[PDB]
Symmetry: D2
Subunit: 187 residues, 4 copies
């Protein structure tokens, strides 16, 4: 029994990014012994989020759920050649090595295929600052393609990424600190 | 007569980052025909900021001042191996090529010298997505050093960065679109 | 029975980088059912390397050994804020998705702790272009520290990285294509 | 009278990259009081290049010409999500702050538009490690487009980049050390 948490960071309502994250979350749960939740950063209290105010219950619950996950699905539109400020603001309040022991799947969408590398150059180093155990391949989609009613090659790549994410999930308590530079100092 | 705008993105009160940005802003104004302002992103309305709501007067004023600047001083603490979510959230609402024609100076502080490269690998590509004209060298300082009552070599580097930023400033209207991939499509 | 290959890319003789890679290679072999080899890129034929000339036996053997490895240890000094040209020249001649199915451990050394992030921002995206299955945490060491006669905290971090690398190794043929965007199109 | 040096780093003969660099070099010289040269890294002695052997006359001449340039045009195909090993190998042997005082124009080509960000995330931080004065916007072209017999919008972007590069060139001896963190310690 795995706990899977998706975090999507578009600041727009009805975002393609959120739909991609949800798709991925469903795909994983359909194929593994998992329960899940989907944190839409846009639905968190803006003031409490920016100030890291964990007296806000819903923010503290989102942080706790992230720290308790076995796998994270981390999704963002590409803004100014990187992940959104909104997504990063959430990542910023997590504990220093919040991602110790965890698998992760980076997802993004954007207007142009030019944005593909923002995940691997931008988001990936941020996940690794937090002691993450295993980040699988990035997947990026051009926004006017998500409909899955998508091109067969694109669909394969996405599904393969999600498959790998699911396969990387760990039951074993022995792995719970892996990725942390100093496992005995918690995680 | 130049317009210089500092933007500092620490989510903490009494931030060293803000003091560094202010120092830099003062240093420039003392040595050039300039006026300045300092946008502390933490003082912007969190809800309006995250949603890009320009019906908020103070947010629209911050955006307008940024678009009207000849030079920007862009300062952030390093969180999770990059600039803060708070800073990026502000950068996110600016027009696509908001930085056309403008000079820029990236500044950061952090707990460890290990964070030095976050500016050049993280922030610099973001500034360049926005058509920026000229980004000079990055300067990073270890937080327990800012007192300027700082080490002589560190002080030289910082002052040299600010000097170069000032020297890069442009009077000429001929440069106002430089850095934009398609200058005739505005800036 | 795993095949572990270290690739070290210093252009200097008697390099600390090579000693770090060798240490790591030995540490892994002492704790797993593994055999290993260590490709010193400096010992490859420069002309054949730069031109990707696989009629050179020793170069073809190095490429084959890399493609056949279950785990790679990838070590470089930090030059001009990134991995060396020498290392990259070798990575450049490998097949497009050469790293499919493979685990990887990024190691570096440098003169200053300022260089720590070159691994995660520079090398890591390059490994991921090649379909790599699992890259664990980066380890960086300040060159005047390697003697292991090193500081206890540094030694822990290094050993933990190597431990995690060893633990990430896969026996299963089911994982041999994982990390490749399209597994049925080989690896 | 400016000295402009192009450095192209494709390991292939008849490279599109070299043709793009040459185009850019010609465009600049036609519009400014400049002389130029074009270092094709592939034509340097591989052994001497990899070992930084400046007893090789042609390598020392290439290094000297780079250090003496007012502007550099730096061109590479995108291999494994970054600049080539061949290009970096040349950059590696230059003095620590070789690029002090100099303007620079990053150019690349690749098979897919997905590679656009490799310049700004990969090459740009490397140029800045060397004290570069002013790096203008990156330009990337999809290889099956260079013929200039190219699409009008693409042609505009390229020409605008080169124009900006030319405009950024400095006559003044006062700028010869700008970009160096400590100008009085040479350049």
């Amino acid at each position: 029994t795995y706990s899977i948490v998706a975090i999507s960071g578009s600041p727009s309502r009805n975002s393609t990014t959120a739909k991609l994250a949800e798709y991925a979350l469903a795909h994983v749960l359909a194929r593994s012994d998992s329960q899940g939740r989907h944190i839409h950063v846009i639905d968190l209290d803006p003031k409490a989020l920016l100030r890291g105010d964990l007296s806000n219950a819903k923010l503290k619950e989102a942080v706790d759920a992230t720290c308790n996950a076995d796998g994270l699905i981390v999704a963002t539109p590409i803004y100014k050649a990187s992940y959104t400020g909104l997504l990063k603001a959430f990542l910023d309040i997590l504990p220093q090595f919040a991602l110790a022991g965890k698998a992760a799947l980076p997802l993004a969408t954007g207007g142009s295929p030019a944005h593909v590398l923002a995940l691997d150059y931008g988001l990936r180093p941020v996940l690794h600052s937090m002691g993450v155990r295993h980040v699988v391949q990035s997947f990026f989609m051009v926004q006017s393609q998500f409909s899955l009613a998508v091109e067969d090659d694109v669909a394969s790549q996405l599904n393969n990424a999600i498959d790998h994410f699911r396969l990387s999930l760990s039951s074993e308590p022995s792995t719970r600190h892996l990725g942390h530079p100093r496992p005995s100092l918690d995680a």
